[PDB]
Amino acid sequence: DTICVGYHANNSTDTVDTILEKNVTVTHSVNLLEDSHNGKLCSLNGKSPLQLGNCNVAGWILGNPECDLLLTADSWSYIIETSNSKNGACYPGEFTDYEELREQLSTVSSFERFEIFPKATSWPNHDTTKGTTVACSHSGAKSFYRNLLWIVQKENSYPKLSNSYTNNKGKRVLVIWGVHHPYRDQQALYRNNHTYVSVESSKYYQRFTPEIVARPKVREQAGRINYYWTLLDQGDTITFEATGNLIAPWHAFALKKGSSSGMMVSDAQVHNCTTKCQTPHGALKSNLPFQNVHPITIGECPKYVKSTQLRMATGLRNIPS
Amino acid sequence: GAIAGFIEGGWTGMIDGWYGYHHQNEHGSGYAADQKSTQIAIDGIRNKVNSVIEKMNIQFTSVGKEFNSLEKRMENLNKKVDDGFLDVWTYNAELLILLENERTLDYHDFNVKNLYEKVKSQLRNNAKEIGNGCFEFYHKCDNECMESVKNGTYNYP
């Protein structure tokens, strides 16, 4: 007539660490560290991502004729750049505050690419066909950006121009333009010994006295165009005017608000799934509150830790005998 | 105490609970998990791990930042931030898990001890104690005398 009191053990091998002893063999343990990813540049939540392919944010926003597919995109949950994303600006030039632009383009899938100064409804006596180069070659032949519009002097006389745009679409409008810095070709292309561009707004506030120089050629180009941008609010008005070297806009982007996202640099292929968290190496589950996969993440993500394993004990001392 | 102590072995053949009993009435023998303490323990461990997970309040955030060639100071600052919280969450995770691992093992240990003492509270004069944590009955015990003690209802001492 005996009765014993005892505890559990099983043929387990999981070992957890404690503050007073190491590699304690425990009957069960739960790991709190997500360390598996499996490359799949997932479409987190619902919105499929955006792959820029051989293009970057520059060539996508400017409308580089190399970057034509991306014109379709009205939405994306997040933006993907690749190691081949070099088709940025064919005619070379300083995209000023390019990092600030990229940061701003980090909020939602609000696109509307819509036209403000149509190619032939708003420019009399102004050459709207000499936009061309051996730089923006659409497979060899000369061409120019799909969201900007060049203006010339009818080859011998540059008139004056000022078209103002008011905001009516009821969201924030990303506006893009450029200033062309060509006298061998200033006196020839736009004919004036004195030009200026002037971009005025309630929030953007500046002019530009264009520059003359024999800049080392890129894509067989010696003069270049500086590519500028700004954000216009509801109701407010942007105003352009120039006696020369306005690389005029052609159609711009009306964004909005809602669910913000991020931008990435990775070389995997998009597949079909979901996730709350995405890395440059692949998706993972936001159930365990820790990762050691990659520091750059996007979404409702676990914390990145430098740890290798986070064995947390649930059972007890595994003592078979 | 109990775990890795005087109860110097677990029971592999016991696979229906963490804490429990062996009976040896001369009517049969076997293992039997004490379900009350096991339910309580599982509730505790679950609230524990679940609390470790849930109190990690997360939101939507991207870590990437582009700084150009003339913003190295602010690049290294943004590192100082990211690496800072790297070190902090690494440290809190490591120590939290060490601490609560020990605390869990002592949780099981103290539960087993409270079961042993719980039955000792009932079998005072009707049992010798055997240092392997097991009771001998100084009377004749049937196939229900082994049950009255399991449900905390043992009769006259």
């Epitope: 099983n10 | 696979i15 039997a32 339910q39 461990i45 679940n50």
Partner: antibody, heavy 124, light 107 residues
């Protein structure tokens, strides 16, 4: 891979006996306790029976105590639901069901992971 | 016994709605609650065990909550295949108790 097969559901008259069975596949059957849960046709799920891993401790519903009998076979890895004294109140779509396993132990008293296809017991 | 009371007994909704269900008993059943999906003529599939733990392979849009007294099953973004009848389970102690059923119809 892992699933449970059910059988024994047939048309029967009140007062007599039947035997239903659930054969396990893909998991250590004899390590788990098991359950029979009946979906009374029209009503929701109604737990009727359950057994430990060894078969020494057996748990029944008050409606069927002393009237049905559960058992299990390790050599055949099969679950036996032996019904006696049938009556149309026992008319139900029978399910064999597996209580879930938790951290290290295969507890009998938990939510149910795997179900059978559902074998229908009709009593006219 | 312990008596479960699912509310509401039924509900219709479109795809994308925030669906809320309750499971509600008498005793202290801590977190021993199991939510089950059901399609007509089909056996259940364990959705939520431990009253919050998501079952393996079940989408992250299924969520459970409640503790001891008040229990809740929340579904964030309903999908067409999710049209079903839902049952909660008591597992604190025998006998095992189930609910009256909470079905989701088409709106």
């Amino acid at each position: 891979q892992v699933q449970l097969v059910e059988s024994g559901g047939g048309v029967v008259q009140p007062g007599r006996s039947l035997r239903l069975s659930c054969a396990a596949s893909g998991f250590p059957f004899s390590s788990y306790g098991m359950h029979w849960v009946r979906q009374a046709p029209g009503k929701g799920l109604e737990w009727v029976a359950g057994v430990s891993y060894d078969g020494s401790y057996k748990y029944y519903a008050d409606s069927v105590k002393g009237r049905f009998t559960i058992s299990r076979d390790s050599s055949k890895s099969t679950l036996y639901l032996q019904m006696n004294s049938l009556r149309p109140e026992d008319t139900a779509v029978y399910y064999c069901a597996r209580p879930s396993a938790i951290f290290g132990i295969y507890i009998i008293l938990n939510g149910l992971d795997v179900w059978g296809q559902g074998t229908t017991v009709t009593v006219s | 016994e312990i008596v479960l009371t699912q509310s509401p007994s039924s509900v219709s909704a479109s795809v994308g709605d925030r669906v809320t269900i309750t499971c509600r008993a008498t005793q202290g059943i801590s977190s021993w609650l199991a939510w089950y999906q059901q399609k007509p003529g089909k056996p259940p599939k364990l959705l939520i065990f431990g009253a919050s733990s998501l079952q393996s392979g079940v989408p992250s849009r299924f969520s459970g909550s409640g503790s001891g007294t008040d229990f809740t099953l929340t579904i964030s973004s309903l999908q067409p295949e999710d049209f079903a009848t839902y049952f909660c389970q008591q597992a604190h102690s025998f006998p095992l108790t189930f609910g009256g059923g909470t079905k989701v119809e088409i709106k």
